[PDB]
């Protein structure tokens, strides 16, 4: 069983981070070194496992989550991070075992004048739990007055557009992100059996 990573990394569309996509993959074999050694990735960070030991992980399922964020937010896709992305859009668990892979996607996801397609959540009444998703669009009450469905002072639409422009600096350009999380019997995967 070869892991179907072609569908993940080379998907025809990528989700907004607030509506991040999850593909659930059963136990499978993959050549992780062709991924980890690829110059096409600007980030390849692993947690609870080293990239050279991915082939030896024992797991039941791997979740492949994917989305678009801007470059200076890739650092937030890690356990224990804070910020608008980690707190209100996509949150990893403390015992995350797997890797975070990103690459610059300016050539595909920017548009002259702005891209209105990719969004992120700006405000929330509480932080997301790990792997929670929130696609609601209720007006966010930042002040002392109920918004009651009207936008204005201290009453904000909760999503913001990235407006990815081709001439943005690299920290404001779009990056596609794939998060692989490995689970063994609903616990984190480990390198099991004879060492």
């Amino acid at each position: 069983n070869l892991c179907p990573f072609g569908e993940v990394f080379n998907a025809t569309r990528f989700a907004s981070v607030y509506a991040w996509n999850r593909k659930r993959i059963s136990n499978c074999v993959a050549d992780y070194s062709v991924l980890y050694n690829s110059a096409s990735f600007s980030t390849f960070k692993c947690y609870g496992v080293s990239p050279t030991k991915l082939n030896d992980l024992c797991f039941t399922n791997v979740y492949a989550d994917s989305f678009v964020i801007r470059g200076d937010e890739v650092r937030q896709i890690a356990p224990g991070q804070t910020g608008k992305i980690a707190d209100y859009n996509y949150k990893l668990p403390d015992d995350f075992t797997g890797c975070v892979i990103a690459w610059n996607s300016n050539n595909l996801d920017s548009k002259v004048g702005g891209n209105y397609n990719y969004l992120y959540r700006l405000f929330r009444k509480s932080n997301l739990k790990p792997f929670e998703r929130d696609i609601s669009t209720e007006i966010y009450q930042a002040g002392s007055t109920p918004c009651n469905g009207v936008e204005g002072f201290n009453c904000y639409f909760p999503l913001q557009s990235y407006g990815f422009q081709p001439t943005n600096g690299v920290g404001y350009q779009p990056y596609r992100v794939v998060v692989l999380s490995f689970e063994l019997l609903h616990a984190p995967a480990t390198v099991c059996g004879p060492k």
Partner: antibody
Amino acid sequence: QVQLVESGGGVVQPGRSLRLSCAASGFTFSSYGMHWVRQAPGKGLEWVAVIWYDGSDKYYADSVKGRFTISRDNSKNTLYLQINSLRAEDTAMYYCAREATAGFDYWGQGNLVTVSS
Amino acid sequence: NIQMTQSPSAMSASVGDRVTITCRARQDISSYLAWFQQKPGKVPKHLIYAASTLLSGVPSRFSGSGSGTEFTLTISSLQPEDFATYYCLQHNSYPYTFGQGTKLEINR
């Protein structure tokens, strides 16, 4: 026509107490949070306090917390600011303001508090 | 509290001129900065919120910008009614806090 009418100011002796009132008319009072702002003679604006539309959350400027209490009686459509142990730093024109989605869109006329012997 | 500092404290200009007023927050306040106008002895008037959104009815010659800690109010083509004191106010976290004000006076 939204109206906010303040009362309760005047000359008051140091160490005493007072309550300013801000009587609301022409709108659903209980749908709006309310703020107090002040301006000492010849000085700039100072934010004083805010109370939630439903009277729950209340917040205060660092310099007034503990001695000032903001409150509201929605059954009487009235906002209040109560000051204990008055001192010279409290002398100021006090304004109430409505917080709406439109902004701070309506204000009281102001009431002058003069702390003096 | 978050300290707000305006600059200059006073400036002079003439009808038809463009003027720029600066407001700096000692801590990051994102884009949640308001601007007010006050004439002597009169009630303040709320002009701008969230750094750049005009209240309804406010002339677009008033233009707010900035984010984080540095913010500006730019008044293009001054009209006689514009000479007045202008105050910023951060509305990002409690307690809300005003800058000390900038007085816009008539040059001669």
